[PDB]
Design a protein around this ligand. Structure first.
Ligand SMILES: CN1CCN(CCCOc2cccc(CC(=O)Nc3nc(-c4c[nH]c5ncccc45)cs3)c2)CC1
Ligand SMILES: CN1CCN(CCCOc2cccc(CC(=O)Nc3nc(-c4c[nH]c5ncccc45)cs3)c2)CC1
Lengths: 389, 394
């Protein structure tokens, strides 16, 4: 019917997950105007007359919609290959956020889609939340909840982690990874840098740029290795054309590396050179050893070894319940179902909403001769006008 | 302002039918991008190829769901013009009858002149006047612009004038309606510039409505307009609009009043006051209106009608209507006991259409391959001058 067509079209515009929602449509127009406003293209009357018609409107839209100048940047609290994470305060609302910038220029010389989705729609206390996502001609912005407690790298460097704390943080990582796995993704880059603590000391996973959606069998088909030298599993490291098919058990190997790091003070496959670490991972059967220091319990050594094995015999091949039932998690202080309501080993002592005590002190595209469309791969990234409430 | 105020202003901008960024204009922007980019030569660019692949499924759905030409059953072609045709249509689903004007995008680019339809779309969509032909929907495809308007079953004034030797009482009625109709357009801030009987349509009751707003221009702060464009057939064009050839002079609403004088003369005399065998001859006679305007020596035209024709057919500076409509309205030619200006459209029209159905075309006379744009080697943006043309009434 006429009304059915009208209504199907209306739902396609409102839907927070639609490709033709208002956010995408405004992105589509903003991208057209960015890609066309160059003197060489303006020689074309179709382009020049179009830009002149939409001049006033594009300036209004740009002023009204979310932009970087809406945020007061307090401190740069993180860095990465394609940008930075900055502690911001939204000038108007006075609300405090962590804002991740991704260089459009650098990305050009697709990963952010799943990272945007996981953070925006997880609705999990274990996943860092995405409130807004916007963009300009130079960057992509992800306005997330600020994690004042810092990461696990910072914790590990300030404390000799006892087993009772290690048990807590491992248990939270396990629940956090199971939450991502249930959403249908493998993290593929589990490391203490990606484990953040909130104002109460409880964990949340961050950095979903390596996330990949599992198939019907719960596998991922990849030809290129992905992750970090120290925490990468043997099957992800050697992943190729012929082979390169793996599941959620690659994230469980990384939990074993993490537990070892916390209790031992070093990563299990540390070497003088990065290439030496690759060699030690591949030879985990002979290279995994424990120092002759009576501190690590029988149960902790067993968990580390149950995870730090070949995929086929790895703990977690039969799901989370076999991890959860491990003797290392046997304690009389918490239960799996209630864990995030318990009092954390380290409760952050914070002075303000912009306290950065857990955070250490920290070009673009040429002028196109012809239409290049550098803004086209980022159309629909905006999360503002059509958010899920 | 506040965060919520900014959020809400942006939201209302997306729903506003007067907005350049509402959903239909934004969907036009995307549909135009995909039309202009889907060529093998541009698809060599990964940004373009990946974008088109991502939006492939969506663009097909949107194209299928949105209003399109195949939604309309075309009954008869009832009009023709430089850039297309006016066809009597019935919307297949709703079963409602409309007149649909098609404007060729190929022709509008070939001949330049691809910006006239904006003021025509706005006037018809937003006039909300019994004197202005209404626009219900405006849509488009890679080749055409469509304007779905109210059908005017009574035909135009050219048809009437050709079937009757118009008496003064009818001429008074039709002139009075044209005057009220033009005043309505003027109040919206536009000068018509092409007032002619072809543009005066009659509805099912015999009352007038102006059509064809393709020459309309928005008046500035001082109520003036400036142009350089070609003047297609000069019989009704005023000396100012003709003197204004190539950015010469600024003129006001009094150019439409001159055309009313030409119209009144045509109705009572049977011929246009400045007719000539050639276009250039008509231009000469208009410019020399002081000596070329004459009346036939037959007492048929009243003192008052000759006075109105002459009050309008003079130089702008002394033209009736220089001090507004009230001086036109108060003219002795309009003095009658049959109607009042305020009530005129409620009176019984001189000629009431006798119609057999909702698709009766008795007042419409019965009525070549379509050239297409070549395959672009580089981005040309042929769909960009039509972004935002789409409009739907609620
Ligand atoms: C598969 N490919 C994808 C692209 N990959 C390039 C790295 C992406 O580039 C970044 C730019 C800036 C920062 C980062 C690190 C990062 O992801 N940081 C994050 N921080 C948070 C965060 C949320 N709330 C916070 N509160 C305090 C501190 C940090 C945060 C979420 S993700 C990466 C390489 C692997
Ligand atoms: C200098 N530039 C100015 C713009 N110029 C464009 C010519 C317009 O191209 C046409 C295409 C097809 C038809 C027409 C004539 C026309 O405007 N007819 C109209 N009919 C109606 C109409 C509404 N309801 C009706 N009911 C019955 C019959 C007709 C109608 C509205 S406009 C023009 C080119 C030169």
């Amino acid at each position: 019917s006429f009304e059915t067509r009208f209504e199907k079209m209306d739902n396609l515009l409102r839907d927070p997950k639609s490709e033709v929602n208002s956010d995408c449509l405004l992105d589509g127009l903003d991208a057209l105007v960015y890609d066309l406003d160059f003197p060489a293209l303006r020689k074309n009357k179709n382009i020049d007359n179009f830009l002149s018609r939409y001049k006033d409107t594009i300036n209004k839209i740009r002023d009204l919609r979310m932009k970087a100048e809406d945020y007061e940047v307090v401190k740069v609290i993180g860095r990465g290959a394609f940008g930075e994470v900055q502690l911001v305060r939204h000038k108007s609302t006075r609300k405090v956020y962590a804002m991740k910038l991704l260089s459009k220029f650098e990305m050009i010389k697709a990963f952010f889609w799943e990272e945007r989705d996981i953070m925006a729609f997880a609705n999990s206390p274990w996943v860092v939340q995405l409130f807004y996502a916007f963009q300009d001609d130079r960057y992509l912005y992800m306005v997330m909840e600020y994690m004042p407690g810092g990461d696990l790298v910072n914790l590990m460097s300030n404390y000799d982690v006892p087993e009772k704390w290690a048990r807590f943080y491992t248990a939270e990582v396990v629940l956090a990874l199971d939450a991502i796995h249930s959403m249908g993704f493998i993290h593929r880059d589990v490391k203490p840098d990606n484990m953040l603590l909130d104002k109460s000391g409880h964990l949340k996973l961050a950095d979903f740029g390596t996330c990949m959606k599992m198939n019907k069998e719960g596998m991922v088909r990849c030809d290129t290795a992905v992750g970090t030298p120290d925490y990468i599993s043997p099957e992800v490291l050697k992943s190729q054309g012929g082979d390169g098919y793996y599941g959620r058990e690659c994230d469980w190997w990384s939990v074993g590396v993490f537990l070892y790091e916390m209790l031992v003070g070093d990563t299990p496959f540390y070497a003088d050179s990065l290439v030496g670490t690759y060699s030690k991972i591949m030879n985990h059967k002979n290279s995994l050893t424990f120092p002759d220091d009576n501190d690590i319990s029988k149960e902790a050594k067993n968990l580390i070894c149950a995870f730090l094995t070949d995929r086929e015999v790895r703990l977690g091949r039969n799901g989370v319940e076999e991890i959860k039932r491990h003797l290392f998690f046997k304690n009389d202080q918490w239960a799996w179902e209630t864990l995030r309501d318990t009092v954390a080993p380290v409760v952050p002592d914070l002075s303000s909403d912009i306290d950065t005590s857990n955070f250490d002190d920290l070009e673009t595209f040429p002028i196109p001769k012809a239409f290049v469309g550098n803004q086209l791969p980022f159309v629909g990234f905006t999360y503002y006008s059509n958010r899920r409430y």
